[PDB]
PDB file of C-alpha atoms in Angstrom:
ATOM      1  CA  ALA A   1      68.878 102.871  74.075  1.00  0.00           C
ATOM      2  CA  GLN A   2      72.332 103.677  75.435  1.00  0.00           C
ATOM      3  CA  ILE A   3      75.809 102.122  75.381  1.00  0.00           C
ATOM      4  CA  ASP A   4      78.681 103.342  77.603  1.00  0.00           C
ATOM      5  CA  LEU A   5      82.251 102.339  76.781  1.00  0.00           C
ATOM      6  CA  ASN A   6      85.124 102.767  79.197  1.00  0.00           C
ATOM      7  CA  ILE A   7      88.428 102.543  77.397  1.00  0.00           C
ATOM      8  CA  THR A   8      92.016 102.204  78.482  1.00  0.00           C
ATOM      9  CA  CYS A   9      95.165 103.902  77.135  1.00  0.00           C
ATOM     10  CA  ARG A  10      96.876 101.794  74.422  1.00  0.00           C
ATOM     11  CA  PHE A  11      99.916  99.714  75.346  1.00  0.00           C
ATOM     12  CA  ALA A  12     101.761  98.689  72.177  1.00  0.00           C
ATOM     13  CA  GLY A  13      98.398  98.914  70.343  1.00  0.00           C
ATOM     14  CA  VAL A  14      96.463  96.957  73.002  1.00  0.00           C
ATOM     15  CA  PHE A  15      93.559  98.427  74.990  1.00  0.00           C
ATOM     16  CA  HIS A  16      90.663  97.260  77.211  1.00  0.00           C
ATOM     17  CA  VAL A  17      86.984  98.105  76.634  1.00  0.00           C
ATOM     18  CA  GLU A  18      84.208  97.695  79.188  1.00  0.00           C
ATOM     19  CA  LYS A  19      80.559  98.082  78.195  1.00  0.00           C
ATOM     20  CA  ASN A  20      78.036  99.593  80.613  1.00  0.00           C
ATOM     21  CA  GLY A  21      80.106  99.159  83.792  1.00  0.00           C
ATOM     22  CA  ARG A  22      79.821  95.348  83.810  1.00  0.00           C
ATOM     23  CA  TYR A  23      80.492  92.129  81.910  1.00  0.00           C
ATOM     24  CA  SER A  24      78.137  92.433  78.928  1.00  0.00           C
ATOM     25  CA  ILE A  25      80.116  91.665  75.752  1.00  0.00           C
ATOM     26  CA  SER A  26      79.877  88.406  73.783  1.00  0.00           C
ATOM     27  CA  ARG A  27      82.604  87.259  71.347  1.00  0.00           C
ATOM     28  CA  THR A  28      80.530  88.470  68.389  1.00  0.00           C
ATOM     29  CA  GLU A  29      80.022  91.903  69.901  1.00  0.00           C
ATOM     30  CA  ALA A  30      83.696  91.975  70.885  1.00  0.00           C
ATOM     31  CA  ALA A  31      84.700  91.487  67.236  1.00  0.00           C
ATOM     32  CA  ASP A  32      82.202  94.203  66.216  1.00  0.00           C
ATOM     33  CA  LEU A  33      83.544  96.590  68.871  1.00  0.00           C
ATOM     34  CA  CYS A  34      87.197  96.191  67.869  1.00  0.00           C
ATOM     35  CA  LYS A  35      86.228  96.724  64.200  1.00  0.00           C
ATOM     36  CA  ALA A  36      84.329  99.889  65.217  1.00  0.00           C
ATOM     37  CA  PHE A  37      87.628 101.031  66.775  1.00  0.00           C
ATOM     38  CA  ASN A  38      89.563 100.251  63.523  1.00  0.00           C
ATOM     39  CA  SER A  39      91.158  97.459  65.594  1.00  0.00           C
ATOM     40  CA  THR A  40      91.261  93.670  65.945  1.00  0.00           C
ATOM     41  CA  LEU A  41      91.017  91.058  68.680  1.00  0.00           C
ATOM     42  CA  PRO A  42      94.555  90.721  70.083  1.00  0.00           C
ATOM     43  CA  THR A  43      96.705  87.643  69.732  1.00  0.00           C
ATOM     44  CA  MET A  44      98.486  86.130  72.737  1.00  0.00           C
ATOM     45  CA  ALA A  45     101.754  87.631  71.363  1.00  0.00           C
ATOM     46  CA  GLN A  46     100.235  91.113  71.215  1.00  0.00           C
ATOM     47  CA  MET A  47      98.994  90.782  74.811  1.00  0.00           C
ATOM     48  CA  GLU A  48     102.457  89.749  76.061  1.00  0.00           C
ATOM     49  CA  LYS A  49     104.030  92.806  74.398  1.00  0.00           C
ATOM     50  CA  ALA A  50     101.514  95.173  76.097  1.00  0.00           C
ATOM     51  CA  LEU A  51     102.038  93.400  79.454  1.00  0.00           C
ATOM     52  CA  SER A  52     105.796  94.145  79.224  1.00  0.00           C
ATOM     53  CA  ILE A  53     105.084  97.895  79.336  1.00  0.00           C
ATOM     54  CA  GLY A  54     102.671  97.779  82.255  1.00  0.00           C
ATOM     55  CA  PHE A  55      99.313  96.711  80.810  1.00  0.00           C
ATOM     56  CA  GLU A  56      97.330  94.854  83.425  1.00  0.00           C
ATOM     57  CA  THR A  57      93.667  94.657  84.366  1.00  0.00           C
ATOM     58  CA  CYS A  58      91.470  92.715  86.784  1.00  0.00           C
ATOM     59  CA  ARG A  59      88.790  92.005  84.174  1.00  0.00           C
ATOM     60  CA  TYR A  60      88.230  89.077  81.800  1.00  0.00           C
ATOM     61  CA  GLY A  61      88.162  90.085  78.147  1.00  0.00           C
ATOM     62  CA  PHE A  62      88.051  88.399  74.742  1.00  0.00           C
ATOM     63  CA  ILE A  63      91.122  88.171  72.599  1.00  0.00           C
ATOM     64  CA  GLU A  64      91.433  86.046  69.468  1.00  0.00           C
ATOM     65  CA  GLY A  65      90.311  82.525  70.485  1.00  0.00           C
ATOM     66  CA  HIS A  66      90.525  83.127  74.266  1.00  0.00           C
ATOM     67  CA  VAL A  67      89.302  85.122  77.244  1.00  0.00           C
ATOM     68  CA  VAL A  68      92.091  86.547  79.403  1.00  0.00           C
ATOM     69  CA  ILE A  69      93.376  88.884  82.100  1.00  0.00           C
ATOM     70  CA  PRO A  70      96.892  90.331  81.756  1.00  0.00           C
ATOM     71  CA  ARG A  71      98.646  90.375  85.183  1.00  0.00           C
ATOM     72  CA  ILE A  72     101.975  91.934  86.223  1.00  0.00           C
ATOM     73  CA  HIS A  73     101.395  91.852  89.991  1.00  0.00           C
ATOM     74  CA  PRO A  74      99.726  88.931  91.812  1.00  0.00           C
ATOM     75  CA  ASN A  75      96.472  89.854  93.514  1.00  0.00           C
ATOM     76  CA  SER A  76      94.351  87.123  95.084  1.00  0.00           C
ATOM     77  CA  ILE A  77      91.216  88.940  93.898  1.00  0.00           C
ATOM     78  CA  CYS A  78      92.472  88.789  90.249  1.00  0.00           C
ATOM     79  CA  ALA A  79      93.010  85.798  87.954  1.00  0.00           C
ATOM     80  CA  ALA A  80      93.404  83.333  90.850  1.00  0.00           C
ATOM     81  CA  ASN A  81      96.500  85.239  92.053  1.00  0.00           C
ATOM     82  CA  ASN A  82      98.260  84.417  88.773  1.00  0.00           C
ATOM     83  CA  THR A  83     100.754  86.490  86.853  1.00  0.00           C
ATOM     84  CA  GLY A  84     101.169  86.718  83.052  1.00  0.00           C
ATOM     85  CA  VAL A  85      98.434  86.443  80.419  1.00  0.00           C
ATOM     86  CA  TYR A  86      95.980  84.294  82.301  1.00  0.00           C
ATOM     87  CA  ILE A  87      93.578  82.239  80.151  1.00  0.00           C
ATOM     88  CA  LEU A  88      90.118  81.500  81.541  1.00  0.00           C
ATOM     89  CA  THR A  89      88.752  78.046  80.739  1.00  0.00           C
ATOM     90  CA  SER A  90      84.962  78.501  80.895  1.00  0.00           C
ATOM     91  CA  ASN A  91      84.291  81.303  78.428  1.00  0.00           C
ATOM     92  CA  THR A  92      80.686  80.853  77.175  1.00  0.00           C
ATOM     93  CA  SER A  93      79.750  83.694  79.525  1.00  0.00           C
ATOM     94  CA  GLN A  94      79.883  87.449  78.760  1.00  0.00           C
ATOM     95  CA  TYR A  95      82.932  89.591  79.509  1.00  0.00           C
ATOM     96  CA  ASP A  96      84.782  92.738  78.482  1.00  0.00           C
ATOM     97  CA  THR A  97      87.032  92.868  75.449  1.00  0.00           C
ATOM     98  CA  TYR A  98      90.604  93.683  74.426  1.00  0.00           C
ATOM     99  CA  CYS A  99      91.432  95.277  71.093  1.00  0.00           C
ATOM    100  CA  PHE A 100      94.674  95.806  69.149  1.00  0.00           C
ATOM    101  CA  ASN A 101      95.231  98.879  66.980  1.00  0.00           C
ATOM    102  CA  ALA A 102      98.052  98.370  64.455  1.00  0.00           C
ATOM    103  CA  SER A 103      98.628 102.119  63.974  1.00  0.00           C
ATOM    104  CA  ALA A 104      99.311 102.875  67.660  1.00  0.00           C
ATOM    105  CA  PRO A 105     102.818 103.614  69.076  1.00  0.00           C
ATOM    106  CA  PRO A 106     104.861 100.763  70.614  1.00  0.00           C
ATOM    107  CA  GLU A 107     104.498 102.627  73.901  1.00  0.00           C
ATOM    108  CA  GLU A 108     101.671 103.838  76.128  1.00  0.00           C
ATOM    109  CA  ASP A 109      99.326 106.208  74.322  1.00  0.00           C
ATOM    110  CA  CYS A 110      96.672 107.953  76.390  1.00  0.00           C
ATOM    111  CA  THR A 111      95.432 110.187  73.543  1.00  0.00           C
ATOM    112  CA  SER A 112      91.719 110.785  74.121  1.00  0.00           C
ATOM    113  CA  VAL A 113      89.508 108.836  71.745  1.00  0.00           C
ATOM    114  CA  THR A 114      86.830 111.353  70.692  1.00  0.00           C
ATOM    115  CA  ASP A 115      84.329 108.886  69.245  1.00  0.00           C
ATOM    116  CA  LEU A 116      83.842 105.401  67.841  1.00  0.00           C
ATOM    117  CA  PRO A 117      85.605 106.089  64.523  1.00  0.00           C
ATOM    118  CA  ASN A 118      84.241 103.178  62.475  1.00  0.00           C
ATOM    119  CA  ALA A 119      80.699 102.876  63.792  1.00  0.00           C
ATOM    120  CA  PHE A 120      77.736 103.313  61.454  1.00  0.00           C
ATOM    121  CA  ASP A 121      74.609 105.488  61.803  1.00  0.00           C
ATOM    122  CA  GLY A 122      72.029 104.156  64.256  1.00  0.00           C
ATOM    123  CA  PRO A 123      69.674 104.887  67.166  1.00  0.00           C
ATOM    124  CA  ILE A 124      72.043 104.191  70.096  1.00  0.00           C
ATOM    125  CA  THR A 125      73.466 106.948  72.231  1.00  0.00           C
ATOM    126  CA  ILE A 126      77.116 105.750  72.408  1.00  0.00           C
ATOM    127  CA  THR A 127      79.416 107.236  75.056  1.00  0.00           C
ATOM    128  CA  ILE A 128      83.189 106.859  75.255  1.00  0.00           C
ATOM    129  CA  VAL A 129      85.014 107.519  78.535  1.00  0.00           C
ATOM    130  CA  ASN A 130      88.803 107.927  78.529  1.00  0.00           C
ATOM    131  CA  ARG A 131      91.090 108.097  81.579  1.00  0.00           C
ATOM    132  CA  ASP A 132      90.491 111.843  82.093  1.00  0.00           C
ATOM    133  CA  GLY A 133      86.761 111.186  82.710  1.00  0.00           C
ATOM    134  CA  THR A 134      85.428 113.185  79.735  1.00  0.00           C
ATOM    135  CA  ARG A 135      82.259 111.691  78.191  1.00  0.00           C
ATOM    136  CA  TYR A 136      82.261 111.846  74.393  1.00  0.00           C
ATOM    137  CA  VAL A 137      78.719 111.249  73.130  1.00  0.00           C
ATOM    138  CA  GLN A 138      77.478 110.227  69.672  1.00  0.00           C
ATOM    139  CA  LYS A 139      74.557 108.473  68.019  1.00  0.00           C
ATOM    140  CA  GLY A 140      75.313 105.317  66.094  1.00  0.00           C
ATOM    141  CA  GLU A 141      75.487 101.549  66.040  1.00  0.00           C
ATOM    142  CA  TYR A 142      78.311  99.005  65.758  1.00  0.00           C
ATOM    143  CA  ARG A 143      76.602  95.665  66.442  1.00  0.00           C
ATOM    144  CA  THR A 144      75.952  93.324  63.556  1.00  0.00           C
ATOM    145  CA  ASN A 145      74.801  90.070  65.244  1.00  0.00           C
ATOM    146  CA  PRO A 146      71.008  89.857  65.820  1.00  0.00           C
ATOM    147  CA  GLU A 147      71.614  87.565  68.817  1.00  0.00           C
ATOM    148  CA  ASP A 148      73.496  90.505  70.426  1.00  0.00           C
ATOM    149  CA  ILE A 149      70.982  93.203  69.464  1.00  0.00           C
ATOM    150  CA  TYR A 150      68.049  91.062  70.616  1.00  0.00           C
TER     151      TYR A 150
END
């Protein structure tokens, strides 16, 4: 089995993670993923701080208690053309996730993340892709909810 993670640079600690090139993360797996990154699910306040230094996406992702898209520029294809930290109502579905790392600089940090630093040993080939396109490959596991694994 194989898991691919595309990660974003950090903006005031905040970054975006996409699993397997599509919406495939539940809230439980989101919490697991952030923990595997020595990080937490962002608060609304943390998202607003990242937004202010240029953090925006066009993908829904879990934060603490919500599912959101941060938007600086209106695009009709993204978050209903809205701007700001847009909160999706109907969030039973699967999405991406956001994560907040407390030890990151209060700026943009594009330092390559070489691996999943707080995963455990396991059978999954886990790949991390940073913005330069390099694939960092390891074997491990990070999921802890049997409803995610099954």
